[PDB]
């Protein structure tokens, strides 16, 4: 057997609140900047497809 080099250390992150951006007041990007998770364009369409207007809100 063989052990591969790439491992799962720098993969997880959690944010309750924290830093923002100065222009948008949205959560900052960043793995080590303690930054937010992106709800992208396709996830906006997935939250309309459930008809969940408050989860989108």
């Amino acid at each position: 057997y063989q052990r591969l080099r790439h491992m799962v250390n720098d993969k997880f992150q959690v944010r309750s609140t924290g830093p923002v951006n100065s222009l948008t007041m949205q959560p900052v990007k960043g793995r080590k900047r303690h930054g937010g998770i992106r709800v992208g364009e396709m996830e906006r369409d997935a939250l309309i497809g459930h008809g969940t207007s408050f989860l989108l809100q």
Binding site: D45, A46, I48, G49, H50, G51
Partner: protein
């Protein structure tokens, strides 16, 4: 913004109508799976009955008006079934155009009406036919699309998701995604 409205029409968010009924019959796709599984629904009559509980249900919805108009259209549509589609007479429109499917019992798409009546006559089987009509016609009424359903997103996701499966080579005419983009 294409969604089901409360009058069952399919409209856009500004208000413009797109369809008058979802798919012609106003049935949710995720509820129609045992719709025409009549022998399954006949074996499980007593369990399906108390699910679709008709006891505290007949006081709230019309029972006779759609069933009378359906038998008038079903009698009129067999007599002129031999004719082509342009010589069809238009005295009786479909019953779904006339009665709200969610308010009138028996206002049913004509394709479910044929298959149900084809089932009852080709099968001689303590359950009547008259209470197997009323169960399956109630099962139609409880399988409808709900108003406010995002059918425009669901349709686009029902083409955009299995198009990702559709990306390979020849197993002439344009195929797959380059045909679908046209």
């Amino acid at each position: 913004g294409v969604h089901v409205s409360y009058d069952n029409s399919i409209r856009d968010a500004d208000g413009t109508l797109v369809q008058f009924m979802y798919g012609g019959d106003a049935i949710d796709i995720t509820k129609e799976s045992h719709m025409t599984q009549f022998e399954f629904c006949l074996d499980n009559y007593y369990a399906l009955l108390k699910k679709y509980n008709p006891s505290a249900l007949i006081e709230h919805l019309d029972v006779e008006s759609a069933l009378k108009y359906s038998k008038k259209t079903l009698k009129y549509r067999k007599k002129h079934s031999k004719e082509p589609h342009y010589k069809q007479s238009v005295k009786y429109d479909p019953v779904l155009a006339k009665y709200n499917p969610a308010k009138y019992l028996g206002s049913v798409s004509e394709n479910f009406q044929d298959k149900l009546e084809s089932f009852l006559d080709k099968n001689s089987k303590g359950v009547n036919e008259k209470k197997f009509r009323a169960l399956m016609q109630l099962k139609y009424m409880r399988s409808l699309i709900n108003p406010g359903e995002a059918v425009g997103i669901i349709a686009s996701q029902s083409v955009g998701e299995p198009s990702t499966q559709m990306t390979l080579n020849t197993f002439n005419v344009t195929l797959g995604i380059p045909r679908l983009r046209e």
